[PDB]
Design a protein around this ligand. Sequence first.
Ligand SMILES: Nc1ncnc2c1ncn2[C@@H]1O[C@H](COP(=O)(O)OP(=O)(O)O)[C@@H](O)[C@H]1O
Ligand SMILES: Nc1ncnc2c1ncn2[C@@H]1O[C@H](COP(=O)(O)OP(=O)(O)O)[C@@H](O)[C@H]1O
Ligand SMILES: Nc1ncnc2c1ncn2[C@@H]1O[C@H](COP(=O)(O)OP(=O)(O)O)[C@@H](O)[C@H]1O
Ligand SMILES: Nc1ncnc2c1ncn2[C@@H]1O[C@H](COP(=O)(O)OP(=O)(O)O)[C@@H](O)[C@H]1O
Ligand SMILES: [Mg+2]
Ligand SMILES: [Mg+2]
Ligand SMILES: [Mg+2]
Ligand SMILES: [Mg+2]
Lengths: 740, 375, 371, 371
Amino acid sequence: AASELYTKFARVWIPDPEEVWKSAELLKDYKPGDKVLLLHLEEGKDLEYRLDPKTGELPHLRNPDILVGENDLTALSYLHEPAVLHNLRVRFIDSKLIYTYCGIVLVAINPYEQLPIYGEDIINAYSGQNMGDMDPHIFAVAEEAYKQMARDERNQSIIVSGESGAGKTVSAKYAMRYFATVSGSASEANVEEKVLASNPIMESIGNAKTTRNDNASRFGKYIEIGFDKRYRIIGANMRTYLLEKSRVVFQAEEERNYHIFYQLCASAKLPEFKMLRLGNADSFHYTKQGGSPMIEGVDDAKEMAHTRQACTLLGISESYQMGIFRILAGILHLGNVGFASRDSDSCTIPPKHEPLTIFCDLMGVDYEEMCHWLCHRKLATATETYIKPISKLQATNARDALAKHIYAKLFNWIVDHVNQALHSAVKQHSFIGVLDIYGFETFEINSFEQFCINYANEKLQQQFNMHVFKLEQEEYMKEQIPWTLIDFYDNQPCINLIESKLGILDLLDEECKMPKGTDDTWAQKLYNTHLNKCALFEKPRMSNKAFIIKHFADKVEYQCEGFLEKNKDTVFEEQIKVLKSSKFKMLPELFQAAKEHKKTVGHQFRNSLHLLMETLNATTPHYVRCIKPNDFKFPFTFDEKRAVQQLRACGVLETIRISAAGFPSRWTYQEFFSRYRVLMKQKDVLGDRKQTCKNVLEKLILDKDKYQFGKTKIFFRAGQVAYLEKLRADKLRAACIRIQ
Amino acid sequence: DEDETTALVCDNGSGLVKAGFAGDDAPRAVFPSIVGRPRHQGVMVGMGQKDSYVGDEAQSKRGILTLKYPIEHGIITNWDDMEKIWHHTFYNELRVAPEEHPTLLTEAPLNPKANREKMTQIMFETFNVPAMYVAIQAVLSLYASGRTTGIVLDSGDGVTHNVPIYEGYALPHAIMRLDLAGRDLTDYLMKILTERGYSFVTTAEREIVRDIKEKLCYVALDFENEMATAASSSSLEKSYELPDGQVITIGNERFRCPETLFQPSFIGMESAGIHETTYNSIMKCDIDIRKDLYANNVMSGGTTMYPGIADRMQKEITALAPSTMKIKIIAPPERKYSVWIGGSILASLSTFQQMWITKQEYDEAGPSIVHRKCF
Amino acid sequence: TTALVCDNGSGLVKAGFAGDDAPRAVFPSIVGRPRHQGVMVGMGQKDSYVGDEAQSKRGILTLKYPIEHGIITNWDDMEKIWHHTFYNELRVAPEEHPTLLTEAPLNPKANREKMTQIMFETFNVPAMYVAIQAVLSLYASGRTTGIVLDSGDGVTHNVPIYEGYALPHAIMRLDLAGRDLTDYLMKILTERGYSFVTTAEREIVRDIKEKLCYVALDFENEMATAASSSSLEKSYELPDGQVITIGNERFRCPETLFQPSFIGMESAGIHETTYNSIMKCDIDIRKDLYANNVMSGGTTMYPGIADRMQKEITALAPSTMKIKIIAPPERKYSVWIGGSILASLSTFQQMWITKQEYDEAGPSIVHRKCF
Amino acid sequence: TTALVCDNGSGLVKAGFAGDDAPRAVFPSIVGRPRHQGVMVGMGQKDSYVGDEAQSKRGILTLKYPIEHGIITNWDDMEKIWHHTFYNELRVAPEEHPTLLTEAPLNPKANREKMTQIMFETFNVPAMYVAIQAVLSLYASGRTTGIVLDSGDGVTHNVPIYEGYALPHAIMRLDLAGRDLTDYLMKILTERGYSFVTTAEREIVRDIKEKLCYVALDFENEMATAASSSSLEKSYELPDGQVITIGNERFRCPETLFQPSFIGMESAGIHETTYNSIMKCDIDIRKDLYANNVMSGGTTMYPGIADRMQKEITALAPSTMKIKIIAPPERKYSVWIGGSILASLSTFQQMWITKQEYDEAGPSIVHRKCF
Ligand SMILES: Nc1ncnc2c1ncn2[C@@H]1O[C@H](COP(=O)(O)OP(=O)(O)O)[C@@H](O)[C@H]1O
Ligand SMILES: Nc1ncnc2c1ncn2[C@@H]1O[C@H](COP(=O)(O)OP(=O)(O)O)[C@@H](O)[C@H]1O
Ligand SMILES: Nc1ncnc2c1ncn2[C@@H]1O[C@H](COP(=O)(O)OP(=O)(O)O)[C@@H](O)[C@H]1O
Ligand SMILES: Nc1ncnc2c1ncn2[C@@H]1O[C@H](COP(=O)(O)OP(=O)(O)O)[C@@H](O)[C@H]1O
Ligand SMILES: [Mg+2]
Ligand SMILES: [Mg+2]
Ligand SMILES: [Mg+2]
Ligand SMILES: [Mg+2]
C-alpha cells in the first residue's frame, strides 16, 4: 500500500555519509518493481538511487513541511529516525526550542547558554493549565507531577538521564526551584531557602573539573521533597551515594580536584587561614597535578564567599566551618609529607618537615608516634603484634589511604548535618522525588569507577525499558486488548554479565579474598570464563591488560589495572589510631562510630543501588532524556552524528512509536462505574457493570479511536481522563443546581 | 550471601573435631572427638545415665565412663559414633538444619575408597545434605599458608602425612603417609613416666598424660646436649599437680617424647624420621622445583605445636640438603587450626559453589561420584 | 608502513622490524603442555605454554618442539608461535605489516606452501616473501662471493655462492645439528654416572653444552691432556644445588661435527662437505671460495672451531691455496640481520608475493616468485 | 679348570660352572642386618645375614640391596655376596677358576673398574671377563639378528642386534623395572586399606606380584570386566594366617610398563622404546628385527605380555611387517645360560683378561678389551 505515496515530487530520506540522512525530492513516480529511483537532493544534484534487490525496500518518506517542528513527535505522519532527528535539528538551530515531547518523555537539549526565559509570570503561565494546553518545559513536567500528587494522593519521582554535559544537573535544579517557588506562599520560606542552599555546598565537596564538564558532579543524589495535605512542602530528605576517592589524590593534566580545595587556597590570605599556615596550589600534590589552579570565567574567592553564605543560610556556625577548613588544610599538609627510602622495604620521614609540623600541630598529635606508624606496620596476627618496616611505596599508599578516609569522614558529616538542618514533620502526606546522577563516561583510560557509574546508568535505562515497553505490553496481553508488540533494546544482558554468580564483580571479590589473587590473574580469569561464550564482552588484540564491554550507549574498554585495590578500599589501622587520638576535638568524633558478611565496594555499592531503584519504582515516574549537541562546547551547535547516537541510546524512536499507538490511561470496570456514576442514567445502568460502562462511554465519546476495552479494564488516550473529569465536575454542578 | 545461606565447613579431627560456617575466621565449634560410655555401676535410684556422652560431657565424667575414639589412623572406627558426632555438631553446637546447607568434609590422602564412600553415603542419606565436597587436609593447610608452592608436613593426633606441592599442581609419587602421630607420643610418654615410677592404666589417666604432653614437652635442638644437660644440671626437671591434688616430677620426659618424631626407633619402627620423609620426597620431585620446595617447607597440625621443632627441622634439613640451598621452615600460629581455616577460604569462593557433589548427582550416579569429582 | 622479518628457528625463534640492528623478539620455539595433575583450586592456568613461560614450569609440563630437521612438526603449534610473536610480544597487526619468512634449502614444497597458506589466511598478511637462510647470513657478512656453512639446532646446510650466484649442483645439507650434540652429551655423561630422561633435564644439559663445550684443534692431544693432566675437568651446580664434574665430554661432544661416527652416523664431517662442494664447483672460482669460507648459525659458536676448520681444510686443499675462515660476532643472528637488510631495499619491495597474487594465482605462486 | 660364570642380579644373584645348562647357585642378592637388642650372651648371633638366612629372619633384620638401578650400592656387601657364593655355596676357590661377570649396557666406567679391581685383588682370580647381559640372552635365543628387550628387578634395557653387531646409537635403557612395580602394588593395595611399611612386608608383596599379576590385552576391557563381573577378584593368605582380597591390582601393576604415567614418569612405554630403536636402525634391517623381537629378564615373565607386545607393535609398524615375539620358557634364566655357553667356547679362551695383564696394564684394560 505505502508504495503508492512514492509518486512524482515526493521528498524522502536518503542515507547521508556525513549528515546521517539527506532529503531527496523524487524526480519520478516509483513504478512497482523500480529497483532504480531517480531523485533530486537538496544540494541541487540529480541521483539514480538503487534499492536492495532482495526486497525492493524503499527509503524513509519525509513528513510534510507543515508538520515539521511540532511540540510532540507523535503528531508526525511518518515515524522514523530521520524524522525525529530532523525535527530536533531544525528546532535547536532555528527556533531555539531546547524542549520537545516524546509522549511521557520530555526531550531536553543543552544550549551551552543562559536562555533567561524563567520568571514569575512563567510560573503563572503553567499554573492552572492541563498538559498540552501550553508548550514543552521542565516547568510543565513539574506542574504535572504536582497535579498527579494533588488529585490522587500518589507519590511521585522525577528521573534525569543524560551524557556528562547535557543540562541534566541544572534542569533538575530548575525543577526543584519550581516546587520551592510554587510552595513559596507558605510562611516557612526559610525551609525551602535551605533546600535551595544545600546544593552549592554539595557541589563544592562533590563536583570537579573534567575534560567533559567543568563542574562534573562525582556522586549521586536522590532528594525526597515531602508535602502536607494542602500540598505545601514540609522539608526534604537528602540521600547521597558513592563519591570518587581517587579525585582527592590524583588529578589529570586537564582536570582538577573538588573545588573546595581551590576555594580554601584562594581564602589563604585571610588571618583565619594564615593560622592554618596554608600554602599555594603548586605546594601540594593534591592540588598541583591539574596544572591550572584557576578555571576561565570564575573566581574561587567569590565561590568561597558563596559557600560561607550558604553555610550561614543552613545555620552552620562559622566555628563548624572553621573546623572543616582546618581538616581540609590538614589533608593538603599530609598530601606533601616527605619520604626517604631505606633498605628496600623500609622508609623514614624528616623530623623537621614543615608540612608535617603544621599537620601534627593542627590535629594535636605526637610527631614521634605519627612517624613510627609511617615507617612501621603491625602484623595481622592476634597472638603476637610484631612490627614490620614498610617501603616508600607502602608509606605513600598509607598517606593517600588516610587522606581518602578523612575526606569520607567529613563528607558523610556534612550530608548528615544538612539533613538535621532540613528538619520536617514526623509524617508527610505525599512526596515528589527529584533524582540526579553522574552520566555515561569514557576516557582513554577506564577504571572501576567508570565501570560502576556506567552500570548505574545501565540500571536506570533498564527500569525505563521495562515500565515504558516490556511491562506495558504485558498489561495489554493480560487484559486481552487488541495490540501490536513493541521492539526495544533489552540491556538486561549487559547487567547479567555483572550481577550473576560467575559475573565480573563476583570474580573481582574472589580475587580480593584469595591472597594470591593478582592483576593479570583476575583479567585472565575473565578471559578463561567469558570470551568462550558471551556476546557483549571481548578482549582487544594488542592490549593484554584490558577488556571491552558493549553498553546501552556504546562499547567502553576498561583497563584491569586499579580494580582489586579500589574494590578492597583498605586503610592502615596504625594511622586511624593516631587520628582517633587527636587533641583537636573534631577528628575523634569523625573517627568514632552471631555471624557476619565482609563487604567490598563492589558488594556494598550494588546493594545501595538495588535499594535506590526499588524506592524509585514505588512512585509514579516521569522521565526527561538529556541530549548534548557538540563536544566543542560551542553555543547552539547541533551535530547530527552526536544526536542520532544519543537518541538511539535512549530509545526515543520506540518511545514515540508506543506513545503514538496511545491508550496509556486505564480504569477498572467497577472503578469507572463508581467514579463516573454521576454521568450514568438510571435507565442505562445494568446488573452487568461492564455493559453499563460500555453503554455510557459510547455516548460520552463519539470518536471510537480514543477508547478501548480490556478483560477487567477500560483503556483511554491522552487528555481523555481530563475530559471525563470536566464532565464529572460540570454534571455534579448541574445536578446540585437542579435539586436546588 | 544476602540471597544465599551458608555452607558448613567441618574438619574430621582424630582426637578433636572442629566445625563452623564458611567465611568465619575461626571455627564456631571445637570439641574432643571422644565418645564416652558408662563403665561404672548402679548408683542413683532415678539414674539419668545417658547411654552415651559426647566431648565435654564425657571429659567431665572421666573414671565414671570409658573413652572411645570414633577415629584411629585417619580412618573411621565406628560409623554410629561418627554419626553421633555429626549430630552433636549440627544439632547442638551449631544447632542448624544440615538439610538446607551445603557441607564440606576433609580427610588424609592415601585413605581407603570405602572410608570415603561410606562417609558420603551416611551424610546424604541420614542428614539430607543438599550438596557436599571432600577435600584433602594437606591442600587446605597450603591455602591457609597463602602460597601456591610449598612442601607441607601435616601431623595430627591419629595420622601424619607429607605432600610437596609446586605451583597449581601435585606430585603423586612424592605423597608420603606416616603411621607415627601424636597418639603414639602420648603412649610413649606413659611408658617413660612408668620407667620413672608413674604407672597409668586407663583412658581417664591417658587424657591427663596428653595434657602433661601438650603443656611441658619440647623438641631438642641437639638430643645429646639435652640428655647431658638433664643429667648434669637437673634444671630441666619441673613439677606438675594431678587432679587429686598430689604432685609429680618430670624433666627428661620433656624432650625424649617429641624426639620420637626424629627417632621412631624409640617405639620400634623401621620407619624414617619426619625430616627424612620430607627430604626424600623433595629428591623424588623434579630437580628444577626442589629449590622452591626447600625454601617453602610448611608445618601443619597439632603435633607440630612443640617448642624448638622449626629450628631443629631447619638444622636437620640443612645437614641433608646442599649448603647453597636456602632452607626455610614456615610455622604459622595455630597449625592445628589451619585445615579448617583453609576449608572456610575454599567454601567462600563462588566458582567453587559448583564443585560440590549434589544430592541429585549422588542419587542418580551412586557413591562412586565422590571418586569421580574430588578424585 | 614498516615490514616485519622473522627467522623460523628450529630451537630459537627471532623477529623484529625491517632495518633494526638486532631482533626485537628472541625466544625458544619449544611449546609446553601440562602433563601433571592440579591440586590448587583457582589458579590462572592454560592448556599450552610458550617459550620462557614453558621454561619457567619445567618438569610440571612436557616440552614439545614445533620444528624438527628444519620441517614443521605441528602447524597449530607453529600458528600459536606466530600468534604469540604478533600480538603478545610485538603487539602489532600482521594485516598491516608485510612479513618476510625464511627456511633451509632442500625443504619440501608442501612445507613452504602450507606455511604461506596459514600466513595469508589466518594472519591476512598484505605482502610476504620466503628467503633461504644461507643467503641472508652471507648478506650480513657483506660479500658477493663465499662458501657459507650454516649449522642450527635442528639442521645444518652448506652453500657455495659466486658473485651472488649459488651453485645448485654443489649445495649440501647435513642431518647432523646441535640437537644431536645435546643427545650425545647426555649419553657420554651417563658413562660418568649422570643419567637423564626428561625434557626438563635436556634443557639443563643444553645449557651445560653451550657454557662448557669446545672444539679440539687436535682430538688425540685433548684425550692425552684429560688422561695425563686432568686440567680440562671443571664443575657445574644443578638447580637443586648439587654439583657435577665434566671434562672429557667438553671436547668429545663438538668433535662429532668432524666425526659423525661418534654416535654411529655414516656421513662425512663438516669440513669434508665444504671441501667436496668446492670440488663440485668450477676450478676458476675454487680459489675465491677457499679464501671466503663463512661460518653461520648457533652450532658454529664453539671455541676453537675456526682454527680447526682452517687446519682441516688446509690438509684437504692444495698448499698454494690461501685458506681463510670468516667467523663474525653474533653469528646465529646474522640470518635475521640479512633478512632486515633485504626487506629495507627499495628494489626488493616489488618481489613480495601479495595477498592478491596468492588468491588469484594459488599457493604455488610462492615457488614461481622466489625461484 | 671349570671356568665360573656369574650373573650379578639386582634382586637375585646366579652362579655356576661353564657348560652346565643351569646355575648351581641361585639366591637373593638382598643381605640382612638385625635390630632390637642382644637376645642372649653369645648365642651364635651374627652382625649380618645373606640371602635365605636373611629371608628366614624378616622383621628381626633390616633388608638391604647391594644393587640399585643396575649399579653397586655398597662394595663391602657385594664382596660379602661374592665370598658367599665362592666359599659357602659353590665351596670352590676363585683363585683357581676363571670368573666371568656381566652387567647392564651404559653402566658407569667407574662401576666396572672397581668391580674388576676387587675380583683381581681380594679374590686373586687368575683370569676374568665382563659381558653385557643383553647379548648373552640373545646367544641363548640362538640367533645372530634380534632386538632383545631385557627387564630385570632393578634396571631395563633394549638392544637391536644384526649379524652379531649391535647398534650403539639405537640401544636404549629404562629407569622403570620390577622394583617400581612392587612399590606401585603397595600403593594400589593401600587404596583398599592394605598399608605396608617394612621390607619384611615388601617381600610378601613381591611374592603376591609374581603369583597373581598379569598383563592386560586391552586395559579398558579388563577394567570393565573387574567392575562388572568381579570374576578377576581372588584371595591370598598372609604369613600370620589372615586372608586379603586382590583383583584390579593384578592388571594395573604390570600395565605401568606400557603406561609409565602411573608412577609419574615422562618416559615412553616398553613397546615405544623397542619400536623407536627399530626406527633408529637402518631401514634394510628393520624387517628382520620385527621378525626377531626377543623377551628377556624376570619382569618379562608375565601372563599375556607377548600377545599385548605383538598387538602394540603391530599397531605402530606398517601392516606389511611380520611382527614376531620370541618369549623363552625361562626369560630370567637366559643371561646366565648365554654366559655358560660363551665361557665354554675354545675361540673365546683368548678373551679373558689375566691377573698379570690387569696388574701390568692397569684397571682401564677391561674397557680396552670389551671395546
Ligand atoms: N535552560 C537552560 N537555561 C540556562 N542554562 C542552561 C539551560 N540548559 C542548559 N544550560 C546550561 O548547560 C550547561 C550544562 O548543564 P549541566 O546541568 O551542568 O549539564 P549535565 O549535568 O548534563 O552535565 C550549564 O552551563 C547550564 O547553565
Ligand atoms: N600444644 C600441643 N602440644 C602437644 N601436642 C599437641 C598440641 N596441640 C595439639 N597436640 C596434639 O595434636 C593432636 C590434635 O591436633 P589436631 O591437629 O587438631 O589433630 P586432628 O586434626 O587429627 O584431630 C593431638 O594428638 C594433640 O595431643
Ligand atoms: N654459544 C654457543 N655455544 C655452543 N652451542 C651453542 C651456542 N649457541 C647456540 N648453540 C647451539 O646451537 C643451536 C642453536 O642454533 P640457532 O642458530 O639458535 O638455531 P635456530 O635459529 O635454527 O633455532 C643449539 O643446539 C644450541 O645449543
Ligand atoms: N613370574 C614372575 N612374575 C612377575 N614378576 C616376576 C616373575 N619372575 C620374576 N619376576 C620379577 O623379576 C625380578 C627378578 O627376576 P630376575 O631377572 O632373576 O632378577 P635380577 O635382575 O635380580 O636378575 C623381580 O622384580 C621379580 O619380581
Ligand atoms: Mg552534572
Ligand atoms: Mg589435622
Ligand atoms: Mg639458523
Ligand atoms: Mg636380569
